[PDB]
From Swiss-Prot, chains A, B, C, D, E, F:
Effect in UniProt of substituting G22V: Reduced protein oxidation. No hippocampal neuron toxicity
Residues represented out of the complete protein: 683 to 713 of 770
Sites annotated Implicated in free radical propagation: G22
Organism annotation: Homo sapiens
Residues annotated as site: Susceptible to oxidation: M24
Site feature: Cleavage: K5, L6, F8, F9, V29, I30
Lineage, broadest ranks: Eukaryota, Metazoa, Chordata, Craniata, Vertebrata
Region of interest (Interaction with PSEN1), ranges: 13-31
Residues annotated as binding Cu(2+) 2: H2, H3
Effect of H2R: Only 23% zinc-induced amyloid-beta protein 28 aggregation
Residues the entry annotates as binding Zn(2+) 2: H2, H3
Effect of D12N: In CAA-APP; Iowa type
Name assigned to this protein: P3(42)
Length: 31, 31, 31, 31, 31, 31
């Protein structure tokens, strides 16, 4: 089974005060 | 089974105070 | 089973005051 | 001339991804 | 002329990814 | 002319990834 580029920016990301997750499965993220 | 580019920006992302998730399956995200 | 490039920026990331996670499975992240 | 407590929380503030301003007069705030 | 307590929290502030300003007058704040 | 306590927390500040300014007048703050 194949997962690829799940998240992708082709361009400048100014910031992130939160959570870029690529693939979550369990637990917690207080981003 | 194949998943690809699920999320994609071809352009500048100013910020994220929240959650860009690509593929969520379980748990919690207080973004 | 194959996972690849799950998160990806082709461009300058100004900052991160949060959490870029690539693949979460359990526990906690107070980002 | 007297200004007092202009903004006030008697209780826990979870977050602020924006701008709590107390007294704005000029310029710019991209919060 | 008298300004006092312009902003005030009587309680725990979890975070601030933005700008608590007390008194702005000019210029810029990219918070 | 008198300015006092312009910003004030009576309680634990978890973090600040931004800008607590007390009194801004000019220039720039990329917080």
């Amino acid at each position: 089974v194949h997962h690829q580029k799940l998240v992708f920016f082709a361009e400048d990301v100014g910031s992130n005060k939160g959570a870029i997750i690529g693939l979550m499965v369990g637990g917690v993220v207080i981003a």
